[PDB]
Design a protein around this ligand. Sequence first.
Ligand SMILES: N[C@@H](CCCNC(=O)CP(=O)(O)O)C(=O)O
Ligand SMILES: N[C@@H](CCCNC(=O)CP(=O)(O)O)C(=O)O
Ligand SMILES: N[C@@H](CCCNC(=O)CP(=O)(O)O)C(=O)O
Ligand code: NI
Lengths: 336, 332, 336
Amino acid sequence: MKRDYVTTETYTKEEMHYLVDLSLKIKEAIKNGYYPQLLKNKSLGMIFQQSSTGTRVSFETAMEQLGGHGEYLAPGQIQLGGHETIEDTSRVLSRLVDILMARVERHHSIVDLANCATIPVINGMSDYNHPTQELGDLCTMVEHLPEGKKLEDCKVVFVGDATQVCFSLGLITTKMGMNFVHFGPEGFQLNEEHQAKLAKNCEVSGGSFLVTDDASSVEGADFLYTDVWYGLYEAELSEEERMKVFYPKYQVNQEMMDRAGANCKFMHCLPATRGEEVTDEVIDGKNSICFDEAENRLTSIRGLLVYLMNDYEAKNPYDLIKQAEAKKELEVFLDT
Amino acid sequence: MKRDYVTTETYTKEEMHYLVDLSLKIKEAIKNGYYPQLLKNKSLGMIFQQSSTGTRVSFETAMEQLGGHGEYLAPGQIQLTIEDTSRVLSRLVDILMARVERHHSIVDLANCATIPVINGMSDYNHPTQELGDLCTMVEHLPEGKKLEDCKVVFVGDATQVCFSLGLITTKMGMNFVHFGPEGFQLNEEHQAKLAKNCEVSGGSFLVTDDASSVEGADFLYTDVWYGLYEAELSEEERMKVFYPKYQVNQEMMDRAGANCKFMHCLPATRGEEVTDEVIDGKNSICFDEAENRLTSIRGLLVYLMNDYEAKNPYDLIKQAEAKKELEVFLDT
Amino acid sequence: MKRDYVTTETYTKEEMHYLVDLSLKIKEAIKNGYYPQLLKNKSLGMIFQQSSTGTRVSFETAMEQLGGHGEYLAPQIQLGHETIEDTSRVLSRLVDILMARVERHHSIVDLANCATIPVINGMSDYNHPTQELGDLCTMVEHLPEGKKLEDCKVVFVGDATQVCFSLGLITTKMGMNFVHFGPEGFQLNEEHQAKLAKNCEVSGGSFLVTDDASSVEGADFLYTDVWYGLYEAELSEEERMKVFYPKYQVNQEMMDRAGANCKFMHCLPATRGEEVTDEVIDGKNSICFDEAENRLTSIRGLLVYLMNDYEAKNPYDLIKQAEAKKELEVFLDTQS
Ligand SMILES: N[C@@H](CCCNC(=O)CP(=O)(O)O)C(=O)O
Ligand SMILES: N[C@@H](CCCNC(=O)CP(=O)(O)O)C(=O)O
Ligand SMILES: N[C@@H](CCCNC(=O)CP(=O)(O)O)C(=O)O
Ligand code: NI
């Protein structure tokens, strides 16, 4: 028996709070030079169907810091297209590593992997969502709360394209009872299915959501968040096309930040295209927190790995009598 | 001085029994949550000239579990003179494995390296598969039968895995059959090596295209039909040679016997060498077999490194002196 | 605050002696089976823009031996769409130390300038400083009977490769006598020679760049490298034979002309039958495989030095460490 981390839709507000608290406590230990060896001798399979810097390095570093090891399985090493291949691969890998992550081209691949594997599976980004980004961004907002405001009192505005990161930000903010806005142009907004999921979250949490092309919607934002304009890895929009759609209205510049408010913080999942979605002035300015945010990709990944492996061990406990017997038998064999 | 693991031809029945016993004891420790740190701070160079999932992940995981680390050197990263590469790597890692296109490459690597070398599969044999398969057969012995009483039938192409299965089964005193079509059977040189094994072990071997040869099998084993990595047989060509006679289906399993277990080294081509019904059925053990790739690799790594240390022992007086000198240097 | 290792030009003779002594003491500990865990739980990002065997394996092995881990990044992470500043800031939050083998020297200079963690040059088109330290360790271990380091003559034969220049830089820094024996159009240039001259004004060493075959006479170490030039733009076999063969082939005649006790060095890989003959590279006076081993020797010393420097400049607060450890333990004991 295992638990997966494919979407925050299967996690409650209270569970997300626990993950944040766990992640931040591990962070404070490591920041002061204590590395808790919570994944000693454990192996993570890391399946990447696309390129990655932040996610890949975070997983590999996290495993080392916690006493285990991450194995990088590059694009083309593992095919996740067809159910039959995915079932066989899942069953082989489940016997060979303790935990799995995958960054996939199509969301059904990560859903299928999690369904077939008997070990925990983590979504490292798909075309649909990006749940490790969600947890990292939540950690970051908690660390940068406005003076005298609670999390649920905050307004978070995503500017631009309806990327998987846009949707994921909507999912986590509404799950935590916050106020979310997607400020984006017609034809590039979160769709009806996206909005129904955000509505369902708000019906439980007391938060709110709005999807609009009204420029005034940035006003009062505590966090202003953006992402690239070129769309999906496999099928990018050209420079000329994306400028036509988004520029200059959706460029996060100092004017937009000032319209949001003097204390509004700037966030971006990275990598950023400077001179497009954001200007140098904003991303390098005093109210940019996007490099703290990048660090918190590692923060959240450490907490997730520990949570999922602790869950696995609680559901599949070791028998300490048989452990002692097995250790003694091995030692006797190697001595005699 | 070192020892290598290039072929089971250089290992006795007693040595293979020791490797099985070591592998299974490590397995039982880890299964119950004790990870023996027998390779602490040791580095394994992993040279892959061809793709791999099972072998590669097994080596990398094994090193982590035992307290060391495996370095994945992907296809094209290391050109394989072989003498120069061997001498360089021998100074930079503690142990080496390689999956190679041509068997002479692994023989040359082992000859030139001054550290232990493990064959991760060649065009000739696949000795880590042999040990894993042996572990699996031991764990799944038929009720009231000894290993040497068992019959193992390989169906289909004369792959390096086919030959390797022949080598290990005959080495352990078992009864081996290659059921395959004319032009795709184990050759005269293969059979002479199997005969030599049987003269020592009291086992037997048979190579035949007679469909009745599966009868009485305790283990029925198969592999893909598309041949070597660098020169695959097309779908049309391989179906013409092997289908349907050599497809392991439920009819063939029933002909072998109600209790016959199904094995496959993986990956499998469902609908060719084996049907979904068989590979997913109650008598399939091929996923236990896949797990035992890691089982056997852990045992091999420990055996070879223990052997290396016995032949090249550490001087504890010089160790103590070196430690003190380093500590004084870093303090002062 | 950090220190980098991009060029030995920023290191004094006394600092290079310290690195040699540290490297050799770690070597003697490991040789006798004591692995000092000086980089426990630390992560090294290894950026390779080009192929490598010796350098790559040395870094990955060194990290394991010292209790940490090296992450191999293939042309996964590009130095492109995202600026060097942005990539440097992201990686600085995710690993503890960085190395890179780069096509163009400015890339490693920029990475070092922008990163807030130590950066090591794993070879560029300009220099190869880890090779320098490994070669120095090797010369120290193989000093001629009754000679001091500064009494030795080192002759590099052939093309003016980055290894040629680097050998010039380290030998002149240590007060030795350096010669580049190479043909017109393939010699160290005026800028190279000005840097060697500056080193010699401080050290009392000497340098010479010449196409005179008699310049090998009296050499204690004779060093060579391949003839095919840079990774991205190799010289053909026909072209390079025309330039270098047979005059610059290191054969037994040349070794005898240098001296009966002259040792042969080569950074590897070698093209047998071109720059060197089988007889020389496999002969009794070849030390190039000890030299190859000392790539690992020197890399271990460098990693320890740079991380010790980093920790001295950024010390852990032991009171806050104790508090963070306690809070984590309480959280894991009491919460769920
Ligand atoms: N919408 C963007 C999201 C990238 C998020 N970035 C990360 O996760 C950091 P990484 O890619 O370096 O791991 C896209 O589809 O590319
Ligand atoms: N005859 C087959 C044997 C494959 C063996 N499989 C394994 O070792 C599992 P892996 O390739 O994932 O490591 C062939 O030549 O392809
Ligand atoms: N002039 C040579 C220098 C190679 C140095 N070799 C090494 O550093 C060993 P490696 O490449 O295996 O890491 C060139 O430009 O290729
Ligand atoms: Ni690794």
